[model samples]
Target: KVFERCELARTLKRLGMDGYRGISLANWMCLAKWESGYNTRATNYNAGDRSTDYGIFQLNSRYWCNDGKTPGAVNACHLSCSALLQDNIADAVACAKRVVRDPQGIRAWVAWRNRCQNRDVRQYVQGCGV
Candidate 1:
């Protein structure tokens, strides 16, 4: 389930997401790294509130997707939970942008808060040429 970092960068860039919504490419890469470790199949179940997070962005089922496998899903993204597992991350990017539009901005993701916020992650995209 490992993915090449540059490959993700290029895919996102082609999708016009290299620096989507004023968020930097490096921050996006940092988010992908900490959230899913660039693994599309990564699905995390939060025991604290019993929610599931999916894909590279770790989108919450409570607000971003619906998975019968997970209880109390809101499907806010109006997408099938399994779709997030596809090799292509187009859906993930679309939903992620929506989340950012919320008042929390990129802080909606704990990963970004913990590792990317107010920090320089440009090193993540070095040589990526995106």
Candidate 2:
């Protein structure tokens, strides 16, 4: 599913992403915007690591989810990567939450660091009523 801006913002807010682990809704919005453009089925393959990133948050197969193919996969989220591709984002959201539990927090996502970190991310949720 490709969510509209405000629609995604509202959904994330309702799912308790507004301030999960000190990351605001706007930051999450910005991450999603840059990571996968709010598309639930977006994916990217990293040939270097032979791992794939999946779903809206772009959780990676090498560390977060299992594709049963990524070499040395930790599968820290303990879920199949296919689950991340579902239209229902509940599992993805749960895995994302688990990701932030690490010391790096939202810095775990390179896209978040490159595009969202320290930027005026408020615009992501500016008119979303979130």
What are the models' TM-scores?
A: 0.91, 0.97
How far residue 81's Cα lies from its native spot in candidate 1, in Å, is 0.9
lDDT (Cα, tens digit) per residue for candidate 1, span 1-130:
5579998887777877656668887888899999999999999888988788888888888888887766666777789878888887888888888888788888888879999998889888889888
In model 2, which regions exceed 4 Å deviation?
A: none
**TM-score (C-alpha, index-matched) for candidate 2:** 0.97
* Local error of candidate 2 at residue 117 (angstroms): 1.1
What is each predicted model's overall lDDT from 0 to 1? 0.84, 0.93
RMSD vs true structure, all candidates: 1.5, 0.7
Top TM-score model: 2
- Identify the leading candidate in terms of lDDT: 2
Count of backbone clashes for each model? 0, 0
After superposing candidate 1, which stretches have Cα over 4 Å from the reference? 69-72
